[PDB]
């Protein structure tokens, strides 16, 4: 039982989310270039800073995000970008159609083996959920509008913007999957798992830093 308001809120988010387009001269670099660790780190940097450009140009389109504290709305992206990059990469790695090449480049880009194992454990775990593109898009928007983010002053104001998305996603889990009432519970469990990755991601950067060169935009979100 979805409403026409939710249906039009889902429609906006989806077409806001399907507008993501990996530029051709980056996506073809994955195969055409060599797999040296420095070259792997170079490509991964470009994809990261590009998806951040994608991410801001999908977040500002979120209904009501612009109507918030300038300092707090900035804080949302600071704490949601890593989790939204994990969620977008998890979708591409479990999509059925080059995923295998990028994985090899991530594994051979200078990351400590302490962070590889949880990363692909998460990717595998997300894959078993068999999420639709609607669930990936709503989950990304839910992840951004989080009330319990750090350095947040108006926590109650964010609640008003998140609750409807959770309301929409919860209906979809009950509508499209009645043969499994834990699908919604397992969906929300991934946001919990993303927090772990978000917080021990700066250590992954640290190892990458004590060795390289980040873009100013990437330095501007991850505090480098």
């Amino acid at each position: 039982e979805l409403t026409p308001d939710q249906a039009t809120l889902l429609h906006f988010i989806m077409d806001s989310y399907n507008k993501q387009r990996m530029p051709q001269e980056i996506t073809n670099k994955i195969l055409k270039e060599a797999f040296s660790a420095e070259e792997n780190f170079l490509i991964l940097t470009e994809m990261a800073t590009n998806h951040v450009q994608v991410l801001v140009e999908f977040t500002k389109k979120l209904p009501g995000f612009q109507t918030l504290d300038h300092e707090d709305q900035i804080a949302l992206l600071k704490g949601s970008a890593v989790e939204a990059m994990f969620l977008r990469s998890a979708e591409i790695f479990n999509k059925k159609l080059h995923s295998d090449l990028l994985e090899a480049r991530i594994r051979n880009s200078g990351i400590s083996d302490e962070y590889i194992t949880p990363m692909f454990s998460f990717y595998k775990s997300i894959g078993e959920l068999k999420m639709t593109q609607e669930e990936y898009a709503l989950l990304t928007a839910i992840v951004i509008l989080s009330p319990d983010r750090q350095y947040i002053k108006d926590r109650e104001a964010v609640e008003k913007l998140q609750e409807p998305l959770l309301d929409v996603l919860q209906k979809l889990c009950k509508i499209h999957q009645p043969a499994n009432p834990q699908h919604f519970a397992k969906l929300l469990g991934r946001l919990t798992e993303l927090r772990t990755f978000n917080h021990h991601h700066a250590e992954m950067l640290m190892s990458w830093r004590v060795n390289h060169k980040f873009t100013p935009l990437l330095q501007e979100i991850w505090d480098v």
Binding site: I74, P216, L217
Partner: peptide, 11 residues
């Protein structure tokens, strides 16, 4: 955090 505010509120 200049570029994020700059990349925000754009036509």
């Amino acid at each position: 955090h200049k570029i994020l505010h700059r990349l925000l509120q754009d036509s």
